[PDB]
Amino acid sequence: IKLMKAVILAAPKPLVRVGGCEIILRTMKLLSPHVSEFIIVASRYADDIDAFLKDKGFNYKIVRHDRPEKGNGYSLLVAKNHVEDRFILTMGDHVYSQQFIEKAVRGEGVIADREPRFVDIGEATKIRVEDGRVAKIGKDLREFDCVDTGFFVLDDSIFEHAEKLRDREEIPLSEIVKLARLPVTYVDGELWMDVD
Amino acid sequence: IKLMKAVILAVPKPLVRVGGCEIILRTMKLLSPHVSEFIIVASRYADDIDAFLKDKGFNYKIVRHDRPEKGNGYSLLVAKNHVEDRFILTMGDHVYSQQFIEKAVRGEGVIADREPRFVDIGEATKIRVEDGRVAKIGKDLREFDCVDTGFFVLDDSIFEHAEKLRDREEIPLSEIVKLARLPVTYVDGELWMDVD
């Protein structure tokens, strides 16, 4: 894909080694041929991540905040002034395959899986899709078409919707996505998994 | 396969949720149609595992020890009197796919991968195979044919070799395997990963 900025939410999860490599390192190594600069939104673990990433050959910036209780939606809002136009948004929770990354990188909006092969469908964030856009989202949906991977390809248009929730004690990414009525891109049955 | 006993060597690593399901739970659910009784060799986290597993519908037994510094090879030796003839041996720190389990259960000796698709080959326990048996093993091998999946199909004779290391401060499983000159069974390119 055309080079773009990669926002990785890390507001310890990213440093957990899966298959002899960390949840963040894996993602960064995979995204590197598609990414200019890595914007890591971190908080309580910002120093640990920075110390880890210094000796690694990536072009990164740690963007720090003090409100982890505000949720990942606030962590997205924190990045507003470090990105312009199109950018990748992913999590430091999640583990991805090259095959998943390769397809998701080419996507638009929410990268959703309608064939979750590895993850438990009951515990996953589900999405109800209407006219190719997010109609409903959440871990306890009754009617759903797909499952939320921790992957998105967003534009500046997001921050307008994310602003409308600034005055809420907790800002879930899902609520922004819902308000934004984000287009959905399907990357089906590829290897991906969250760690908790 | 013909029903047999399954030894699982065990925030505790087996209680870490990968894809919305705990490592031990994933492995237990998958092995359940091939398994009579489950034998969890645990130590510092024995109580946590037991409390987790009580409400789950499996036939399990917690076998406790006080020497975690002695290594996983000692954890195997601890299980000697809870198994007879053929039995499955796996780690509670490894995640497996159904496709991997299905092939591995039909296996004999060490279940090895000569096509590691989702693990870092540099950090993995490597094996050098001579005449279908383990010639060399270890994380820093120069010459190697495959990689150790933390999955084995053993008989009683393993403990005869495991006994020869009783008087060592540390007993690595790999050294027993080396001593035993274990046959190797290949399950290539299937999804499996260690969680550190």
Q: Across the interface, do B194 and A19 touch by the CB < 8 Å criterion?
A: yes
A112 is in an annotated binding site: no
Residue A9 among known ligand-binding residues: yes
* Nearest CB to A19 within list B19, B97, B119: B119
Closest CA to B161 of B178, B174, B180, B175: B180
Cα atoms found within 13 Å of the Cα of residue A51, Cβ hemisphere only: 5
> Contact at 8 Å (CB) between B193 and B150?
no
B168: amino acid identity, one letter: R
Assess A115–B contact: CB distance below 8 Å, yes or no: no
Instruction: Please give the domain boundaries of chain A with CATH numbers for all domains.
Output: 1-196 (3.90.550.10)
Nearest-Cα distance to chain A for B82, in Å, is 31
Buried b (16+ CB within 10 A) or exposed e, A9-44: bbbebbebbbbbbbbbbbbbbbbeebbebbbbbbbe
- Looking at this protein, which amino acid is placed at residue A44? R
Known binder of ligand: residue A10?
yes
A19 interface with B at CB cutoff 8 Å? yes
Is the separation of the CB atoms in A91 and A9 below 8 Å? yes
Show the CA angle centred on residue B120, arms to residues B114 and B123, nearest 5°.
100
Q: What are phi and psi of A25, to 5 degrees?
A: -55, -50
Could you give the CA distance from residue B91 to residue A168 in angstroms, rounded to a whole number? 44
Question: Is the distance from CB of A140 to CB of A114 less than 8 angstroms?
Answer: no
Amino acid sitting at position B148: D
- Interface check A124 vs B, CB under 8 A: yes
DSSP symbol at A101: H
Does A102 count as an annotated binding residue? Answer: yes
Q: How many CB atoms lie within 10 A of CB B101?
A: 24
Determine the residue type at A85: D
Q: Rounded to 5 degrees, what angle do the CA atoms B102, B126, A27 make?
A: 75
| Distance (Å) of CA A162 to CA A69, A142, A177, B27, B157 | 16, 25, 9, 40, 63
- Inter-chain CB proximity B20 and A120 less than 8 Å: yes
Q: Name the residue among A173, A181, A175, A116 with its Cα closest to residue A149.
A: A116
Q: Give A3→chain B minimum CA distance, Å.
A: 26
Contact in structure between A142 and A56 (CB atoms under 8 Å):
no
Surface-to-core class of residue A113, CB atoms within 10 Å of its CB (0-12 exposed, 13-18 middle, 19+ buried)? buried
Chain A residues close to B195, C-beta within 8 Å: 16-18, 195
Q: Decide: A96 and A27 in contact? Cβ < 8 Å.
A: yes
Q: How many CB atoms lie within 10 A of CB B121?
A: 11
Say how many C-beta atoms besides its own lie within 10 A of residue B149's C-beta.
Answer: 28
Phi and psi torsions of B12, nearest 5° = -70, 140
B98 vs A67: CA distance, rounded Å: 41
φ, ψ of residue B158 in degrees (nearest 5): -60, -45
DSSP, res B157: T
Instruction: Decide: B137 and B125 in contact? Cβ < 8 Å.
Output: yes
Closest residue in A to B15 (Cα) is: A196
Q: What gap in Å lies between CA A98 and CA B174, rounded to an integer?
A: 31
Rounded Cα distance between B145 and B128, Å, is 5
Q: Which residues of B touch A122 (CB under 8 A)?
A: 20
A148 shares contact with chain B (CB less than 8 Å):
no
- What does the radius of gyration of chain B's CA atoms come to, in whole angstroms? 16
Residue with tokens 């195997």: B76
